[PDB]
Design a protein around this ligand. Structure first.
Ligand SMILES: OC[C@H]1O[C@@H](O[C@H]2[C@H](O)[C@@H](O)[C@@H](O)O[C@@H]2CO)[C@H](O)[C@@H](O)[C@H]1O
Ligand SMILES: OC[C@H]1O[C@@H](O[C@H]2[C@H](O)[C@@H](O)[C@@H](O)O[C@@H]2CO)[C@H](O)[C@@H](O)[C@H]1O
Lengths: 132, 132
């Protein structure tokens, strides 16, 4: 399984930047942010070829281990065998996801939330995390 | 309790850099690196005023929840209410701890170890982590 960070605090109006290396044979990778392993405010899942999706980003929420409604984005500035950096900005009722090429999209926050305290990731090798 | 990162991999010959903010009223802070919450290859504990120590760094190991022999360093480039950055470099039989002012010291590795996969910290606010 991937790597987990817990009991940091990402507060409203701030962003968490992740930089990582995507393996050359990656079919997908996921970065999860939320409250614990059962509660993801965002599951951010770029898919190269996975679950029938080619070069799409699938986002979803997970509340008490139940997936919500998926959000599909055609933006896809990712390459296999390369570094990528993504910023997750926390606003009252949505996360703003900021990509390395300047493209951005919002994802609604569907669950009660004070601070973001949990991160996990899978399919991508950590290079750096930082809080702004 | 502090924040925990788990199932990253810090391999021999690489370093993990941590940047964080020391609260203005901090009596001490600790950064732990090892294999899990019971097994710290290093417990790195700058003490402003704690356990009778004033401006010392106390390091120790912890194996299956048992503290080892403490190592005391007089180097202390830290201030309360300020940012600090420290690098932990992994070599075969010791960690090299590199401080922001260029001062460095080694700490012996006392336990079986393939990769470093666990980090925790207490008393210091995360700003960034990166792997080199
Ligand atoms: O919604 C996020 C999760 O999707 C799961 O795959 C979905 C898939 O996106 C979809 O096309 C659908 O028909 O069903 C699958 C679930 O049965 C992934 O398996 C999971 O890892 C999340 O990414
Ligand atoms: O060795 C690391 C731990 O030290 C503990 O305090 C020690 C202290 O350094 C020492 O002077 C001694 O006499 O006993 C104490 C343990 O009983 C800290 O409590 C612990 O948090 C570690 O830093």
């Amino acid at each position: 399984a991937g790597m987990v960070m817990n009991n940091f605090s990402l507060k409203q109006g701030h962003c968490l930047e992740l930089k990582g290396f995507i393996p050359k044979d990656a079919k997908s990778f996921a970065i999860n942010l939320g409250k614990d392993s059962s509660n993801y405010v965002i599951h951010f899942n770029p898919r190269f070829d996975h679950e029938g999706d080619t070069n799409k980003i699938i986002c979803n929420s997970k509340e008490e281990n139940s997936w919500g409604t998926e959000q599909r984005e055609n933006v896809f500035p990712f390459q296999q065998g390369a570094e990528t950096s993504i910023c997750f900005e926390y606003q009252a009722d949505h996360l703003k996801v900021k990509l390395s090429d300047g493209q951005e999209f919002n994802f609604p926050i569907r669950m009660p939330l004070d601070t973001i305290t949990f991160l996990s990731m899978d399919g991508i090798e950590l290079k750096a995390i930082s809080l702004h």
